Design an enzyme around this catalytic site. Structure first.
Site, PDB file in Angstrom:
ATOM      1  N   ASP A  87       0.361   2.149  -9.184  1.00 45.96           N
ATOM      2  CA  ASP A  87      -0.108   2.121  -7.770  1.00 45.96           C
ATOM      3  C   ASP A  87      -1.165   2.930  -7.320  1.00 45.96           C
ATOM      4  O   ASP A  87      -0.830   4.100  -6.933  1.00 45.96           O
ATOM      5  CB  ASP A  87       0.978   2.005  -6.816  1.00 45.96           C
ATOM      6  CG  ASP A  87       0.772   1.632  -5.582  1.00 45.96           C
ATOM      7  OD1 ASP A  87      -0.429   1.605  -5.284  1.00 45.96           O
ATOM      8  OD2 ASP A  87       1.582   1.434  -4.842  1.00 45.96           O
ATOM      9  N   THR A  88      -2.568   2.522  -7.608  1.00 43.32           N
ATOM     10  CA  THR A  88      -3.648   3.454  -7.335  1.00 43.32           C
ATOM     11  C   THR A  88      -3.728   4.011  -6.075  1.00 43.32           C
ATOM     12  O   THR A  88      -4.200   5.219  -5.484  1.00 43.32           O
ATOM     13  CB  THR A  88      -4.797   2.970  -7.919  1.00 43.32           C
ATOM     14  OG1 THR A  88      -5.339   1.703  -7.228  1.00 43.32           O
ATOM     15  CG2 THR A  88      -4.830   2.675  -9.283  1.00 43.32           C
ATOM     16  N   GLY A  89      -3.095   3.374  -4.886  1.00 45.41           N
ATOM     17  CA  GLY A  89      -3.308   4.030  -3.554  1.00 45.41           C
ATOM     18  C   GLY A  89      -2.091   4.490  -3.076  1.00 45.41           C
ATOM     19  O   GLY A  89      -1.984   4.954  -1.775  1.00 45.41           O
TER      20      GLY A  89
HETATM   21  O1  LIG Z   1       0.083  -7.534  -0.033  1.00 38.80           O
HETATM   22  C1  LIG Z   1       0.690  -6.612   0.691  1.00 38.80           C
HETATM   23  N1  LIG Z   1       1.995  -6.736   0.922  1.00 38.80           N
HETATM   24  C2  LIG Z   1       2.574  -8.154   0.716  1.00 38.80           C
HETATM   25  N2  LIG Z   1       3.746  -8.616   1.497  1.00 38.80           N
HETATM   26  C3  LIG Z   1       4.029 -10.103   1.504  1.00 38.80           C
HETATM   27  C4  LIG Z   1       2.899 -10.806   0.636  1.00 38.80           C
HETATM   28  S1  LIG Z   1       1.924  -9.650   0.381  1.00 38.80           S
HETATM   29  C5  LIG Z   1       0.449  -5.125   0.903  1.00 38.80           C
HETATM   30  C6  LIG Z   1      -0.869  -4.871   1.126  1.00 38.80           C
HETATM   31  C7  LIG Z   1      -1.268  -3.400   1.301  1.00 38.80           C
HETATM   32  C8  LIG Z   1       0.012  -2.523   1.184  1.00 38.80           C
HETATM   33  C9  LIG Z   1       1.067  -2.885   1.024  1.00 38.80           C
HETATM   34  C10 LIG Z   1       2.351  -1.786   0.958  1.00 38.80           C
HETATM   35  N3  LIG Z   1       2.039  -0.530   0.179  1.00 38.80           N
HETATM   36  C11 LIG Z   1       2.364   0.395   0.604  1.00 38.80           C
HETATM   37  O2  LIG Z   1       3.159   0.577   1.774  1.00 38.80           O
HETATM   38  N4  LIG Z   1       1.838   1.595   0.368  1.00 38.80           N
HETATM   39  C12 LIG Z   1       2.640   2.859   1.049  1.00 38.80           C
HETATM   40  C13 LIG Z   1       3.128   3.813   0.161  1.00 38.80           C
HETATM   41  C14 LIG Z   1       3.517   3.624  -1.296  1.00 38.80           C
HETATM   42  C15 LIG Z   1       3.939   4.797  -2.069  1.00 38.80           C
HETATM   43  C16 LIG Z   1       3.599   6.131  -1.634  1.00 38.80           C
HETATM   44  C17 LIG Z   1       3.192   6.574  -0.693  1.00 38.80           C
HETATM   45  C18 LIG Z   1       2.917   7.711  -0.122  1.00 38.80           C
HETATM   46  O3  LIG Z   1       2.912   8.648  -0.924  1.00 38.80           O
HETATM   47  N5  LIG Z   1       2.992   7.813   1.165  1.00 38.80           N
HETATM   48  C19 LIG Z   1       2.807   9.406   1.609  1.00 38.80           C
HETATM   49  N6  LIG Z   1       3.078   9.574   2.935  1.00 38.80           N
HETATM   50  C20 LIG Z   1       2.999  10.922   3.203  1.00 38.80           C
HETATM   51  C21 LIG Z   1       2.675  11.791   1.888  1.00 38.80           C
HETATM   52  S2  LIG Z   1       2.749  10.671   0.707  1.00 38.80           S
HETATM   53  C22 LIG Z   1       2.808   5.413   0.313  1.00 38.80           C
HETATM   54  C23 LIG Z   1       0.745   1.946  -0.572  1.00 38.80           C
HETATM   55  C24 LIG Z   1      -0.591   1.685   0.532  1.00 38.80           C
HETATM   56  C25 LIG Z   1      -0.750   2.489   1.766  1.00 38.80           C
HETATM   57  C26 LIG Z   1      -0.869   4.005   1.495  1.00 38.80           C
HETATM   58  C27 LIG Z   1      -0.657   4.820   2.407  1.00 38.80           C
HETATM   59  C28 LIG Z   1      -0.502   4.533   3.806  1.00 38.80           C
HETATM   60  C29 LIG Z   1      -0.144   3.138   4.095  1.00 38.80           C
HETATM   61  C30 LIG Z   1      -0.412   2.291   2.983  1.00 38.80           C
HETATM   62  C31 LIG Z   1       0.544   1.408  -1.803  1.00 38.80           C
HETATM   63  O4  LIG Z   1      -0.433   1.972  -2.390  1.00 38.80           O
HETATM   64  C32 LIG Z   1       0.550  -0.289  -1.852  1.00 38.80           C
HETATM   65  O5  LIG Z   1       0.324  -0.431  -3.140  1.00 38.80           O
HETATM   66  C33 LIG Z   1       1.722  -0.666  -1.242  1.00 38.80           C
HETATM   67  C34 LIG Z   1       2.846  -0.523  -2.180  1.00 38.80           C
HETATM   68  C35 LIG Z   1       4.185  -1.433  -1.991  1.00 38.80           C
HETATM   69  C36 LIG Z   1       3.695  -2.802  -2.349  1.00 38.80           C
HETATM   70  C37 LIG Z   1       4.747  -3.868  -2.334  1.00 38.80           C
HETATM   71  C38 LIG Z   1       6.180  -3.742  -1.872  1.00 38.80           C
HETATM   72  C39 LIG Z   1       6.332  -2.141  -1.352  1.00 38.80           C
HETATM   73  C40 LIG Z   1       5.318  -1.410  -1.315  1.00 38.80           C
HETATM   74  C41 LIG Z   1       1.360  -4.159   0.865  1.00 38.80           C
END
Ligand SMILES: O=C(Nc1nccs1)c1cccc(CN2C(=O)N(Cc3cccc(C(=O)Nc4nccs4)c3)[C@H](Cc3ccccc3)[C@H](O)[C@@H](O)[C@H]2Cc2ccccc2)c1
Lengths: 99, 99
Positions: free
Chosen positions: A25-27
């Site tokens: 997961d690149t994001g």
């Molecule tokens: O299409 C989508 N969903 C669908 N649902 C139904 C049909 S399609 C969809 C589109 C975009 C994002 C996502 C949901 N999403 C996230 O919530 N995160 C938060 C994330 C994940 C992992 C780690 C962190 C992290 O390190 N957070 C931190 N906070 C503080 C320090 S670090 C953050 C990030 C993106 C993000 C980064 C920062 C802040 C907010 C978000 C990931 O990079 C995304 O791939 C993805 C991961 C995911 C995918 C499927 C199920 C559960 C989780 C889903």
């Protein structure tokens, strides 16, 4: 490998003697794994996502083998919907994005 | 180009005449952007992420330029913290993941 993005980029990991699969997961800054027995110490932390924040336990210095590549780092275990491997481990296996 | 993951992989995009930065996100099925104003008709949808679910509005057939490459696709607008380009558009600019 080179993986193209027409399907979820899923990979096998072995952690703690268990095999799971996970999304590259690149994001995601950090790696978050669903609830799992890991031995050891851990610190509670919270991370954010789309949707909100979640409280998680942080384990440091854990060995993971991601597609056979070993790397060691922090994993967070908590109520994620899916096991995600984030940039902290992706840099270690040399993972790059190309377009 | 090639992008290593030591930093968050942000690109500039142009959408609805506006310039933004967005994260390239292989773990995301759909692209979702902060609220902004886009023309036209939309419909509600609800998306899940880590942390929970949000309701978004679905715009179909939007033109985005991501770096210098154009794509047309569905874009979801809603209360994300960060603009995310997901695999639905990533596939169109020919993005690969390599390790
Ligand atoms: O299409 C989508 N969903 C669908 N649902 C139904 C049909 S399609 C969809 C589109 C975009 C994002 C996502 C949901 N999403 C996230 O919530 N995160 C938060 C994330 C994940 C992992 C780690 C962190 C992290 O390190 N957070 C931190 N906070 C503080 C320090 S670090 C953050 C990030 C993106 C993000 C980064 C920062 C802040 C907010 C978000 C990931 O990079 C995304 O791939 C993805 C991961 C995911 C995918 C499927 C199920 C559960 C989780 C889903």
């Amino acid at each position: 490998p080179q993986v193209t993005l027409w399907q979820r980029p899923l990979v096998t990991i072995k952690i703690g003697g268990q095999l799971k699969e996970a999304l590259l997961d690149t994001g995601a800054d950090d790696t978050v794994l669903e609830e799992m027995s890991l031995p050891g110490r851990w610190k509670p932390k919270m991370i954010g996502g789309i949707g909100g924040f979640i409280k998680v336990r942080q384990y440091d210095q854990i060995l993971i083998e991601i597609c056979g590549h070993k790397a060691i780092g922090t994993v967070l275990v908590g109520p994620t919907p899916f096991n995600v491997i984030g940039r902290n481990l992706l840099t270690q296996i040399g993972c790059t994005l190309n377009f």
